[model samples]
Target: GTPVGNNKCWAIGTTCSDDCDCCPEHHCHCPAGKWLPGLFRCTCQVTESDKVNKCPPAE
Candidate 1:
């Protein structure tokens, strides 16, 4: 679970080219959570939709 690694990620209302463009990480992977649909936010998750996405930040 993590962010897109930086602010380059997209918001909710933002128009996405596709699932990938709309999402933060390189793959369609993000924090596995339910989106309210218009909150304009993104998170990290592990799911089937995800691939070998980016790594989490250093603690």
Candidate 2:
């Protein structure tokens, strides 16, 4: 299930307002995996609350 095209995509940790914000060629998805909360970015561990149920369902 492709999320978006790389033409209008951003790298990991880059701020975005959409689910299709990751690079097409990158093994990533906007706000899918990793830490942090909210539909924010395609990044790694961010806030500390992530371990405290920040994602709410992280599945």
Candidate 3:
């Protein structure tokens, strides 16, 4: 399913508030992925693949 519109939309991973639903319009959906926990924030991973991959589910 499409998470958002505008193909030009830049990856805003992690920028959304933690443990909440403030993603999307907040430009904070970490569609790319995340690493550092605790303080949630979107920081583009320049090394990620060219395709969109959801963040791996935690154990």
Candidate 4:
């Protein structure tokens, strides 16, 4: 998701330097810390990383 309004990255917890950097690998993209047109936070649908049983944060 492209970060819009207020010129914020909207990468959930972290204030990002770039909008494109919000999602990494298996991580999902979230706008305004949500799915937009709803109230769903960005979540990892599939875990594919060295971290086991762990949810990776938005880079």
Candidate number with greatest TM-score: 2
Q: Candidate 4: deviation at residue 33, Å? A: 13
Worst 10 residues of 3 by lDDT: 50-59
The TM-scores, one per candidate, come to 0.22, 0.24, 0.19, 0.19
- Pick the lDDT winner: 4
lDDT tens per residue, model 1, 1-30: 653433243454434344344333333323
Error of 3 at 22 (Å): 17
Residue 39, model 1: lDDT of 43
The regions of model 2 sitting more than 4 angstroms off are: 1-7, 15-18, 29-59
Question: What overall lDDT goes with each candidate model?
Answer: 0.38, 0.38, 0.36, 0.40
lDDT at residue 7 of model 3 (Cα atoms): 28
- In TM-score terms, candidate 3 sits at 0.19
Rank the candidate models, highest lDDT first: 4, 1, 2, 3
Q: lDDT tens string, model 4, 1-59?
A: 84343322234454334444333433343545345556555443233656322223442
Query: How high is the lDDT of residue 32 in model 1?
Result: 36
TM-score, cand. 2: 0.24
Per-residue alpha-carbon lDDT of candidate 3 for residues 1-59, written as tens digits (9 for 90 to 100): 54543223344543333332232223343444357655444643333333432332221
Per-residue CA lDDT of candidate 2, range 6-46, in tens? 33545455554445343333333345545665565455223
Residue 30, model 4: Cα distance from true site in angstroms: 2.8
